[PDB]
Design a protein around this ligand. Structure first.
Ligand SMILES: *[C@@H](C)[C@H]1/C(=C/c2[nH]c(/C=C3N=C(/C=C4\NC(=O)C(CC)=C4C)C(C)=C\3CCC(=O)O)c(CCC(=O)O)c2C)NC(=O)[C@@H]1C
Ligand SMILES: *[C@@H](C)[C@H]1/C(=C/c2[nH]c(/C=C3N=C(/C=C4\NC(=O)C(CC)=C4C)C(C)=C\3CCC(=O)O)c(CCC(=O)O)c2C)NC(=O)[C@@H]1C
Ligand SMILES: *[C@@H](C)[C@H]1/C(=C/c2[nH]c(/C=C3N=C(/C=C4\NC(=O)C(CC)=C4C)C(C)=C\3CCC(=O)O)c(CCC(=O)O)c2C)NC(=O)[C@@H]1C
Ligand SMILES: *[C@@H](C)[C@H]1/C(=C/c2[nH]c(/C=C3N=C(/C=C4\NC(=O)C(CC)=C4C)C(C)=C\3CCC(=O)O)c(CCC(=O)O)c2C)NC(=O)[C@@H]1C
Ligand SMILES: *[C@H](C)[C@H]1/C(=C/c2[nH]c(/C=C3N=C(/C=C4\NC(=O)C(CC)=C4C)C(C)=C\3CCC(=O)O)c(CCC(=O)O)c2C)NC(=O)[C@@H]1C
Ligand SMILES: *[C@H](C)[C@H]1/C(=C/c2[nH]c(/C=C3N=C(/C=C4\NC(=O)C(CC)=C4C)C(C)=C\3CCC(=O)O)c(CCC(=O)O)c2C)NC(=O)[C@@H]1C
Ligand SMILES: *[C@H](C)[C@H]1/C(=C/c2[nH]c(/C=C3N=C(/C=C4\NC(=O)C(CC)=C4C)C(C)=C\3CCC(=O)O)c(CCC(=O)O)c2C)NC(=O)[C@@H]1C
Ligand SMILES: *[C@H](C)[C@H]1/C(=C/c2[nH]c(/C=C3N=C(/C=C4\NC(=O)C(CC)=C4C)C(C)=C\3CCC(=O)O)c(CCC(=O)O)c2C)NC(=O)[C@@H]1C
Ligand SMILES: *[C@H](C)[C@H]1/C(=C/c2[nH]c(/C=C3N=C(/C=C4\NC(=O)C(CC)=C4C)C(C)=C\3CCC(=O)O)c(CCC(=O)O)c2C)NC(=O)[C@@H]1C
Lengths: 161, 160, 209, 160, 161, 161, 160, 161, 161, 160
């Protein structure tokens, strides 16, 4: 896992080259975005417990998934579902702080797709749930920070896609 | 980078970053401008800095470049300066990142074993890094000189 | 003319983006260095004790035990650990010899898979060779589950690696042979990801008798 | 199911079924007629039992339906009664199995996460299932009501 | 795992409904099985090592398998095969008490064929030995309970082979 | 594992007979070769660290692996290569001293191919390094003594090939 | 084997074989003529050695041949003779290999489990091995007798 | 296979939408690159034999592979390598002209790994020959055409690695 | 742990002096006694189980200890006592081989006395059993070896007493 | 000692020493005469060996005795010669014991940290150990020199 700064450093190290103008411009872009990312992180850790509530309420409540026979019935399944949403929210916030999708490749999306397939859980409904949490987080974190959160959430969906 | 360390600590603790970690990242981002200035100053004088560092190292340790030494031939001295360029590039990476993590990860873990395998005196490499630090501090501001000398001393201590 | 050392350190070709992505993560994963090791240095800081307990839960069971319990059934163990009456090794062993652990990683798996999961959780890597698998098999068959985790945790390897105060964590062993890839396969798949055996049994190079 | 965790306990110890567990299975299989009778009596009387339990729950604690409550919506009351039906089915399954395996393994593990996510107080549903026990003992034979109230006590205490 | 009672409970839970007569009668059937299966389990646990003893004695014993070259050769392999027979007997009586063979698939047949192939264990000899323990248990417990013991042991053989 | 003596023992024990004249002669042949094997092993152990030096120098140094971004860049990785070559030399010495190429299969080649493939280690580069090991050791322990080390290093290469 | 045992011990510590280990292998290979002669002698008198050992055992421990004993008929005495032959062959294998690992790997690990599954008195098996040791000592030189008796006593101790 | 022009089509059609401004801009970018792509493809086709000859000269000739016993020995095998390098160059040209490296993993990389493993082909030697071809073509077609050709050849090598 | 050689080395090293004449004489004496020590250790390992058997039978069986109300009652306590005696004999043999009693000091005595005091184990009965083991093992190893063996067993008794 | 190592290995498996271990112990006690002869040879000429090795190292490494070096001054050089005597004594202990455990326990654990604290070039210590090695080998028999070479090389490698 590497953030934007460490990603740039590793990319420069791959060619054995110093930080050229692109290196400094990307670094300054990340430094400018750091203020927004930190404030959005504070705001999202503010409501990480509550945000997933309306994220699932408008996504996976009173539907075929929650009822018996659905893959979200039974307290273990609902608890694992809310915990999965919490994991996605926390790790996407981690990526937003780091400003890189590297963490999601190995710590979230690595083995998640076939894990869900073996579990039999509906991947498409998870996709819509992550979209719903996308709008929910965009509502609280703002537009630009909302877009930064949404790009990572869409990356999670695409990996789970 | 402090960002990656904070993220790793939070994930291992399975929590969002505490307020203090957020302030630490905030101050890191604020000082990123000066850190980038220091990195640019180091990068702009790479060839010069390696020239004086290598010359002063050879003045202090003439045996390594003398006949029979590890760095006798022109190709061997070029390889010395290549290693020196590698280490100064790592120092620039660390100065940009604000922590010695990239330096340790790319060029400080197992360096002793590498130079034992290659027959290179590790103490001479540490002396070369010290010459690097001295010459670089000679062309930087006092505060910037200390900030870069922190990473240089970390590399020197790990080599020693 | 460019200096010779620059050419020596200069990388050939242009080094396009695909090679950058491929070679940025070339060898052992950065998770070997991008992880935390929990040591209960002092029992006076209750926050540190709770963090260590949660880390132990996340290590032994691979997850926080929120959606898998009625209530906190390890409360007495947590109190004893926080009271400095037992070591972190004792807490880990108690977590191993608990009904929750048997329900999770013992009931739904064969004893070979049980050995795999137990070695992956407490020892931190995959089983070394066929002798270790055999020994754990006799332990499981003759004494059941509790003796298995007891033998693993109280062995010399656990004390030398994790000791009495360090929570077990994923390991990256060089030796023996095939231990590293088996451990990588064990820790590269999520909990309940699939059911086949990563290390069913080492095929003997020499068939004695 | 008594036999399911009996066999699980035996397998965990790597031993055959003990005489005590065997005798408990003996008594369970011999007395399963009463358990099946209780299953039928609970299935048949579902509507009245849930109705009276919900009404007494509402009358004891109006805050569930009071302004700002989690059940103020007319639909929220029906959702709560659906919860009542779910727990009643769980109690029926447990009395059928002669053991509290299905109650915990269908509607008890992680219920606190359930209610923190949905905001429903745990004590309120505990009182509701207490009312279920009271009305069921009212509608049930005394000896049968003993076991039914025992399982209701289990669910109320464990979920409390 | 899961028994017949839990099997019916799961089947009624998938529909999210109460137990009906169509499951009522099948629970009556298992309850009537009852004392027979538990007598059988007690008697099987009685001489637990015995059935393994004469079963191995009549099928694999005094044969090429126990001779040098055969996979039953050497004391270590002898103990390993005997331990495997104890596994098979214990899990078969487990299934008989529970009334469902899923525990075997959940505990025995999972990876057993592949692990034996890796170890080079003769599948045919093991299946014959399990048939031997089947017939020994049938002679030791009677016809009916012997019949359930035989069906579970034959399921073990079919999964293994 | 296995050696020449254990090879003869297993050959006699697979069919269960004692040691006949042929096995006796094979054991005497191994004992005759034992002097050369012990001398070569002692010499290689004395110069084991030295050999990998010029083996890497004449086969891996100043090549694409060593440049930045190469798999043998990142001095931790250089030390990993030195350690792996030392392991190869030590286990080849083990096989030479034992006289059987069985230790390599169950202690070196076991998972090494998949290990390098997962790690992206250049297999042909490692093969060339082991070949350089063979040439260097052949010029250090003589031709006849170096023949066995060449045989076992070649076995390692073929298994890794 | 001694070579295999020393190699395993060295590999456990992750080091080349020590000079003492190399000296041990050199001495073993040099003296191998005596060990090969011992194995030849043991294999040569195998029939008479096993017959005398079993005969003396039977009057020494009549229970094994007594009614109710494990080996009552001539058929079971045949199994006793076969087991004693196996153990003599294992002793010869250990003698030629110079180390007890072949014996332990073939017929010592889990031997108690085998003789428990067969009902055989392991003490009487140890007595039979002791009788074979005595009869072998009667058919060998003093030093050869001691060299064989080392592995015979190892088998007896592990058996008992 | 997929190219830069149909890549946008598939990307837009997976969600079922029409071609928006982003897709239009991507198509215009590909059409702008088409000039250099066509020129590079024509120049490469004109000089394919000489390019493969020069790549073989500086990467394979006068080495262990070409010597007797080596995989380059047995002139049928040398012609097989000439044909393989011609295939790699032609398919790299196909991918470069297409603008997407989907033909590489569909008509070249599909099954190549176990092909070379079964044939015992030096994978790293072939990779080195591919970089030699990349360097030769980059010095003949220019900087940007060489850029794209090196990108696709390195994709092929990474598939090989 | 320390033996005679290590004991002499440590005694000389604490004073920071080289091995003098007295240390040389002690080392020579230990080397001379090494043959007898090895023979005694081999004999004891040959009949350790029988030694414990006879010592327990003569010193403990059919006494007040083995009867109900004694410490050795119940199979569990009997097995614990037997294991204790076996470990006592084995560690005494280890000390006899090493020529020093230190291994008994930090592998048999530290915590043993107050452990027996906590569990109520009779120290006098244990001492009598160890004396019985002493005379039984003397009867096997001859007077010369039995002197040293009983010296170490009496050391164990005195520490435990 | 090899006896201590064998006892530790046996106690690790909770088993009596195998016949091979007893044979190795017997060989070690037989060779104890040669071990003691080598130890006496090393101890008799310890002062001359240390003095010659120190002079040779000073000739190769004048910096340590140069101004500003660790060993500048008569007392500093005397302390270094005392350290050389200490390591020669440790080598003698390893020679008599037949292994390297006493050397590792006394003067090879934490030696790097200790000398880094003292500001001593560890490479100079390794070179001094080497020089002592050649000096001892010159005045001692070929086989004795080879046997002591193992301990000298172990000390040198631990230094380096
Ligand atoms: C003079 C300054 C010193 C010196 C240097 C020296 N080095 C080599 C050879 C190599 N140096 C390296 C170094 C690195 N590899 C890495 O990945 C990094 C970290 C980013 C470093 C610093 C390597 C890999 C080699 C060998 C491979 C190669 O050179 O490409 C030499 C020549 C050795 C030879 O035998 O050719 C020299 C002279 N030597 C001294 O004595 C001075 C102290
Ligand atoms: C009324 C006095 C009580 C009450 C009820 C209440 N429940 C909900 C919502 C839900 N309850 C459940 C319950 C279950 N799911 C299961 O799988 C099981 C059995 C295994 C149970 C018991 C679920 C799934 C929901 C959500 C969807 C649904 O309604 O079925 C609400 C709504 C609260 C909200 O904000 O959504 C209410 C009011 N609440 C109380 O406070 C009383 C204890
Ligand atoms: C002069 C008499 C003629 C001539 C010969 C020539 N050959 C080469 C180079 C090579 N020749 C071969 C041939 C073979 N390799 C095989 O495996 C087989 C038998 C199975 C054959 C016949 C090869 C492979 C090479 C190149 C690789 C290597 O040399 O190892 C050259 C040099 C070419 C260059 O540019 O280096 C020459 C001169 N050439 C003529 O014009 C004459 C007809
Ligand atoms: C007779 C057909 C079987 C048989 C029995 C047998 N036992 C002994 C000796 C002992 N048995 C015990 C066992 C216990 N003592 C206890 O207090 C309890 C706790 C519940 C048990 C289980 C003991 C301790 C002894 C030793 C004497 C003593 O009691 O202190 C013998 C004689 C052994 C001897 O050498 O004297 C015999 C014959 N033996 C068989 O072969 C039959 C199967
Ligand atoms: C919720 C949006 C959907 C849903 C969830 C659900 N998940 C599980 C089970 C698991 N979920 C995971 C996933 C992770 N665990 C991790 O540590 C991480 C790393 C970032 C992830 C992504 C895993 C591993 C499991 C299996 C183990 C477990 O029990 O948690 C379940 C229950 C599955 C079961 O069989 O019990 C459920 C219900 N289900 C839905 O229908 C939603 C769309
Ligand atoms: C070096 C010339 C080539 C090379 C090698 C390389 N390997 C690793 C890492 C590991 N190597 C192994 C191998 C083994 N472990 C064993 O037990 C056995 C039997 C003795 C073998 C063969 C393992 C397990 C690892 C991973 C664990 C570890 O690194 O300690 C690396 C470094 C990987 C990293 O991430 O640092 C390297 C560089 N790579 C090349 O490019 C050369 C051709
Ligand atoms: C006996 C019927 C046949 C036979 C068997 C045999 N098995 C082994 C080794 C193992 N057997 C198992 C099996 C299991 N482990 C489990 O957990 C389960 C379910 C609970 C099963 C079925 C395993 C894991 C092993 C390896 C570890 C061990 O020894 O315990 C052997 C020895 C293999 C070897 O040499 O390594 C043998 C011989 N042999 C026959 O001849 C019969 C036909
Ligand atoms: C004779 C003095 C003792 C005795 C012997 C006895 N043994 C058996 C049966 C078997 N014994 C073995 C032995 C071995 N298997 C191995 O792998 C090894 C070498 C590594 C040995 C020594 C075996 C295999 C059998 C089974 C038969 C077969 O060949 O497959 C019996 C028969 C028991 C019965 O009831 O059938 C007997 C009698 N019994 C005593 O009482 C003496 C102490
Ligand atoms: C037998 C000669 C006497 C005897 C034995 C006895 N011991 C225990 C319990 C323990 N004994 C020990 C001893 C040791 N631990 C060590 O590390 C060492 C050195 C190897 C020794 C000697 C320990 C630790 C225990 C407790 C733990 C355990 O038992 O495993 C008992 C059990 C007492 C009880 O009530 O449980 C007994 C009976 N008893 C006699 O009467 C003999 C004189």
């Amino acid at each position: 896992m590497q953030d934007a700064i460490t990603a740039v450093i590793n990319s420069a190290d791959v060619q054995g080259k110093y930080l050229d103008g692109a290196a400094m411009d990307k670094l300054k872009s990340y430094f400018a975005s750091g203020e927004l990312r930190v404030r959005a992180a504070s705001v999202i850790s503010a409501n990480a417990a509550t945000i997933v509530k309306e994220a699932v309420a408008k996504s996976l409540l009173y539907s075929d998934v929650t009822r018996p026979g659905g893959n979200m019935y039974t307290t273990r399944r609902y608890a694992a579902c809310i915990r999965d949403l919490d994991y996605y929210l926390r790790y996407a916030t981690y990526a937003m702080l780091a400003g890189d999708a590297s963490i999601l490749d190995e710590r979230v999306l690595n083995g998640l797709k076939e894990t869900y397939n073996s579990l039999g859980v509906p991947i498409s409904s998870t996709v819509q749930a992550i979209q719903a949490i996308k709008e929910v987080t965009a509502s609280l974190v703002g537009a630009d920070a909302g877009k930064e959160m949404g790009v990572y959430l869409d990356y999670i969906c695409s990996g789970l896609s | 980078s402090i960002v990656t360390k904070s993220i790793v600590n939070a994930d291992a603790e399975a929590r969002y970053l505490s307020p203090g970690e957020l302030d630490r990242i905030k101050a890191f981002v604020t000082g990123g401008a000066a850190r980038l200035r220091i990195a640019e100053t180091l990068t702009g004088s790479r060839e010069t800095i390696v020239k004086q560092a290598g010359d002063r190292l050879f003045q202090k340790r003439p045996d390594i470049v003398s006949p029979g030494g590890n760095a006798y031939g022109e190709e061997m001295t070029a390889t010395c300066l290549r290693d020196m360029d590698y280490y100064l590039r790592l120092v620039t990476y660390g100065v940009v990142s604000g922590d010695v993590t990239p330096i340790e990860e790319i060029g400080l873990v197992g360096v002793r074993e590498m130079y034992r395998s290659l027959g290179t005196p590790i103490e001479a490499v540490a002396q070369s890094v010290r010459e690097m630090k001295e010459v670089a501090s000679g062309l930087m501001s006092s505060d910037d000189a200390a900030e870069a000398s922190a990473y240089f001393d970390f590399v020197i201590g790990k080599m020693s | 003319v460019t200096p010779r050392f620059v050419e020596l350190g200069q990388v050939s070709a242009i080094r396009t983006e695909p090679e950058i992505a491929y070679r940025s993560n070339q060898g052992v994963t950065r998770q070997r260095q991008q992880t935390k090791v929990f040591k209960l240095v002092s029992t006076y800081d209750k926050v540190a004790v709770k963090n260590a307990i949660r880390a132990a839960y996340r290590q032994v069971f691979e997850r926080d035990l929120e959606p898998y319990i009625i209530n906190s059934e390890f409360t007495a163990l947590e109190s004893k650990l926080s009271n400095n009456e037992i070591n972190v090794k004792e807490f880990i062993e108690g977590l191993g010899t608990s009904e929750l652990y048997m329900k999770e990683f013992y009931a739904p798996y064969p004893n070979t898979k049980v050995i795999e999961m137990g070695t992956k959780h407490f020892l931190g890597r995959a089983p070394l060779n066929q002798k270790e698998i055999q020994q754990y098999n006799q332990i499981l068959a003759s004494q059941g589950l509790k003796a298995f985790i007891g033998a693993m945790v109280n062995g010399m390897e656990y004390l030398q690696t994790f000791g009495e105060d360090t929570v077990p964590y994923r390991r990256f062993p060089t030796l023996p042979a095939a231990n590293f890839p088996n451990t990588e396969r064990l820790y590269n798949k999520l909990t309940k990801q699939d059911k086949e055996l990563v290390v069913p049994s080492f095929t003997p190079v020499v068939k004695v008798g």
